[PDB]
C-alpha cells in the first residue's frame, strides 16, 4: 500500500530545470517514443515537427511541459524513459540534485 505524489509536484522537479530542458531535450528527438506511450498526441507530434530545426522548438519545449502536465503521471514516467535512452547524462543530472 503506497501513495503517489500529485502531477504538479512530479513535474516541479524537471520543470525547475526548464532553461536546460528547452536547450538540450528536443521534443523532435523523442516524438516517436512519446506518442508510442500516448503522452504525445498526433496533433502535438505534427505541431512539434512543424518547427523541428527552428529556434521556435525551444519555446515549444516549455509549452510542451504544460501539455505533458495534462497527462502528468503517465507523461512524467514516459519522459524519464525517453531521457534514460536519448539523454541519460542529463536524465541522471536533473534527478541528481
From Swiss-Prot:
Q: Outcome of residue 35 to E?
A: Abolished homooligomerization and formation of BCL10-nucleating filaments
Q: Which residues form the CARD domain?
A: 6-97
Q: Which domain of life is it from?
A: Eukaryota
Q: Explain what the record says happens when changing residue 70 to W.
A: In IMD103; reduced cytokine production in response to C.albicans infection; impaired NF-kappa-B transcriptional activity; reduced production IgG antibodies in response to C.albicans infection
Binding, Zn(2+): 3, 10, 73
Summarizing the annotation, the consequence of altering residue 18 to W is: In IMD103; reduced cytokine production in response to C.albicans infection; impaired NF-kappa-B transcriptional activity
Effect upon mutating residue 73 to A: Strongly reduced zinc-binding
- What's the effect of swapping residue 37 to A? Does not affect zinc-binbing
Name the consequence of residue 35 to Q.
In IMD103; abolished homooligomerization and formation of BCL10-nucleating filaments; reduced cytokine production in response to C.albicans infection; reduced production IgG antibodies in response to C.albicans infection
Identify the tissues in which this protein is expressed: Expression is restricted to several populations of phagocytes, such as macrophages, monocytes, and dendritic cells. Highly expressed in spleen. Also detected in liver, placenta, lung, peripheral blood leukocytes and in brain.
- Where is it located? Cytoplasm
Spans traversing the lipid bilayer: none
Residue numbers of Phosphoserine PTMs: 2
Q: What is the protein's quaternary organization?
A: Monomer. Homodimer; homodimerization is mediated by the CARD domain which forms an extensive interaction with the adjacent linker and coiled-coil regions; leads to an autoinhibited state. Homomultimer; polymerizes following activation, forming a nucleating helical template that seeds BCL10-filament formation via a CARD-CARD interaction. Interacts (via CARD domain) with BCL10 (via CARD domain); interaction takes place following CARD9 activation and polymerization, leading to the formation of a filamentous CBM complex assembly.
Function, as annotated: Adapter protein that plays a key role in innate immune response against fungi by forming signaling complexes downstream of C-type lectin receptors. CARD9-mediated signals are essential for antifungal immunity against a subset of fungi from the phylum Ascomycota. Transduces signals in myeloid cells downstream of C-type lectin receptors CLEC7A (dectin-1), CLEC6A (dectin-2) and CLEC4E (Mincle), which detect pathogen-associated molecular pattern metabolites (PAMPs), such as fungal carbohydrates, and trigger CARD9 activation.
Q: What domain comment accompanies this record?
A: The linker region, also named autoinhibitory interface, is required to prevent constitutive activation and maintain CARD9 in an autoinhibitory state. Disruption of this region triggers polymerization and activation, leading to formation of BCL10-nucleating filaments.
Pathology linked to this chain's protein: Immunodeficiency 103, susceptibility to fungal infections: An autosomal recessive primary immunodeficiency disorder with altered immune responses and impaired clearance of fungal infections, selective against Candida. It is characterized by persistent and/or recurrent infections of the skin, nails and mucous membranes caused by organisms of the genus Candida, mainly Candida albicans.
Q: Which protein, by its recorded name, is this?
A: Caspase recruitment domain-containing protein 9
Native species of this protein?
A: Homo sapiens (Human)
Q: Which residues of the full protein are shown?
A: 1 to 97 of 536
